[PDB]
């Protein structure tokens, strides 16, 4: 996940090493050569600024495109369940083709201004 009301999506700040960062994340690890794995993260931002944002994560044996499409829909569904009006959904995804043993990871890190 939940983005606090009035919080802003910002580029990753300069984090102090060792910081205890509240983070929502999705990840997938695979040891199958040639397998494509992906992880994605999304955040549904409400029109009503008094409400909170909903963070969703996804991982799976699929493409970067499919992972992002899926996670965005998951965030939208969360807002549907709440009956909240949508401003926009921001998301990012990553894919990895396993050579020997790989990991795909996506996260939403909560921090301070």
């Amino acid at each position: 996940x939940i983005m606090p009301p009035e919080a802003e999506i910002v580029p990753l700040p300069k984090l102090p090493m060792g910081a205890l960062v509240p983070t929502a994340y999705g990840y997938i690890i695979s040891d199958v050569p040639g397998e494509t794995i992906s992880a994605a993260i999304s955040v549904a931002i409400p029109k009503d600024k008094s409400l909170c944002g909903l963070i969703m994560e996804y991982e799976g044996k699929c493409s970067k495109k499919e992972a992002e499409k899926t996670v965005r829909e998951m965030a939208k569904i969360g807002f549907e369940m709440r009956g909240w009006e949508l401003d926009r959904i921001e998301s990012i995804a990553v894919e990895h083709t396993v050579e020997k043993l790989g990991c795909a990871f996506a996260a939403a890190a909560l921090w301070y201004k």
Binding site: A24, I92, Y112
Partner: protein, 48 residues
């Protein structure tokens, strides 16, 4: 009035990051992915 004790209150920013990496072990691959995403040197407290 400039806010004090801001770090003791609720987080007010969210950043989306992502990365991937190979690794000799699952944990080393995970670590590599975090490093690739830019958050490899902080402690992740998983929120659910």
């Amino acid at each position: 009035i400039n806010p004090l004790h801001a770090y003791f209150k609720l987080p007010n920013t969210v950043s989306l990051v992502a990365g991937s990496s190979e690794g000799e072990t699952p944990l080393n691959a995970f670590d590599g992915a975090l490093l690739n995403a830019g958050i490899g040197n902080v402690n992740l407290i998983r929120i659910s």
